[PDB]
């Protein structure tokens, strides 16, 4: 992708994760886990709803036509009959050609997007008290429960509580 | 189309060991795992355990901590669940079911195998006996049927007249008699006109006994 | 053709309102006993040996 997250610094997608687009693994002292991100998911979700509403919406052709087949040879008016269509006909495959590469590669583009904004949001909840490990794991330097693991889950988590022990573990 | 497909009926008695089957397709296999919970007949639900087929980590409920190993294979994509030292309460249904390849996860049991049935007995295999219940009327609609009686172990077919005969007719669970065998009766609702015309026969399949019987019904006056 | 060596040709006339129709012949006329009502719309003919269905 553009920002390199999916088939990027993130190694593998997990198709075990089957409620929801992006989430989290942890492992603490209780043991590991999976779990969503609805909030990102649906970001994700709803971009590219709108998207295909957008090329799938009042895209019907309507108006009368000319005869676009012919028994028998003519000359001038049905040569130019079949040349408006023939036109017509490569100029709207040409259309349907670049919308579909322009909006693919957007919608890759924007899911990478989707990942990597929920882990900068991630490290920047984390504050001091984890490091990047690269792969898209952060190491915690600080002892955490699943309950504080949700915490982060769920944005309410209270970088100041663990700040000291998790420096003091980073440090020496 | 994720399919869990599991192994055969099982019938054992107690003491022994048994070890059931779960062959997975239609999905990565060591992207998930898998969970393993038994019905007892007519009653609810009971969790005994999960495994990853990931990390190949390992959660049992206390209760089968000592009898139940669960274990998969790769290979076959196949998870196996094996129980030791059997008593006859642990007579039941073992259901097989995906679960997050992670214990803690979000999600649970979104795909069930077709079950396998375990029977704990110390009664050896027999066949069913068959004896009519005879109708008689005290001009109208009378019932008649078939009991089937002492078999072992479960399941029993019961048609009549080869099939041709469905409408009116109830075929009852099996009771399970305080001798270790089962019993059941089927029945059917008939016009008692067609009682001295017609023939009604009931067909009565007992697979693990290789029993095959046919009986019929008249009043006798 | 159909057993006649004999044809006919045929022409249409529009006429529009406050405008007279006028016809002159001294011989071989095949004369309109009237006239089709015309109507602007979306209707159009095509050639297609589909079955209709309900």
């Known amino acids: 992708g553009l920002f390199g997250a999916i088939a990027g610094f993130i190694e593998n997608g997990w198709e075990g994760m089957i409620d929801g687009w992006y989430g989290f693994r942890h492992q603490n002292s209780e043991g590991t886990g999976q779990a969503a991100d609805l909030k990102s998911t649906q970001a994700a979700i709803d971009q590219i709803n709108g998207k295909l509403n957008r090329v799938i919406e009042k895209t019907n052709e309507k108006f009368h036509q000319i005869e676009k087949e012919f028994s028998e040879v003519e000359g001038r008016i049905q040569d130019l009959e079949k040349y408006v269509e023939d036109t017509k006909i490569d100029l709207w495959s040409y259309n349907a050609e670049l919308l579909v590469a322009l909006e693919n590669q957007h919608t890759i583009d924007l899911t990478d997007s989707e990942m990597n904004k929920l882990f900068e949001k991630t490290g920047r909840q984390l504050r001091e008290n984890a490091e990047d490990m690269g792969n898209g794991c952060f190491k915690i330097y600080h002892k955490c429960d699943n309950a504080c693991i949700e915490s982060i889950r769920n944005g309410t988590y209270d970088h100041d509580v663990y700040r000291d022990e998790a420096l003091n573990n980073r440090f020496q | 189309q994720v399919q869990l497909q599991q192994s055969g009926a099982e019938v054992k008695t107690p003491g022994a060991s048994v070890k059931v089957s779960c062959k997975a397709s239609?999905?990565?296999?060591?992207?998930?795992?898998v969970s393993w919970i038994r019905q007892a007949p007519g009653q609810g639900l009971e969790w005994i355990g999960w495994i990853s087929a990931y990390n190949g980590d390992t959660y049992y409920a206390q209760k089968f901590q000592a009898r139940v190993t669960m274990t998969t294979d790769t290979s076959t994509t196949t998870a196996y669940m094996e129980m030791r030292s059997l008593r006859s309460d642990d007579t039941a249904v073992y259901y097989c079911?995906?679960?997050?390849?992670?214990?803690?996860?979000?999600?649970?049991?979104?795909?069930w195998g077709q079950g396998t049935l375990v029977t704990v007995s110390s009664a050896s295999t027999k066949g069913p006996s068959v004896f009519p219940l005879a109708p008689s009327s005290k001009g109208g609609t009378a019932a008649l049927g078939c009991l089937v009686k002492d078999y072992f172990p479960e399941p029993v077919t019961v048609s009549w007249n080869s099939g041709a005969l469905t409408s009116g007719v109830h075929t009852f669970p099996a009771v399970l008699q305080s001798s270790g065998l089962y019993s059941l009766s089927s029945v059917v609702t008939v016009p008692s006109s067609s009682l001295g015309t017609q023939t009604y026969i009931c067909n009565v399949n007992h697979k693990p006994s290789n029993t095959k019987v046919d009986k019929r019904v008249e009043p006798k006056s | 053709v159909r057993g006649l060596s004999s044809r006919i040709s045929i022409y249409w006339t529009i006429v529009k309102p406050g405008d007279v129709l006028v016809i002159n012949s001294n011989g071989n006329l095949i004369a309109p006993r009237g006239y089709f009502k015309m109507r602007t719309g979306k209707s159009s003919i095509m050639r297609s040996d589909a079955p209709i269905d309900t």
């Open positions: 079911a995906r679960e997050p390849p992670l214990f803690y996860s979000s999600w649970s049991l979104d795909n």
């Open positions: 239609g999905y990565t296999f060591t992207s998930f795992g």
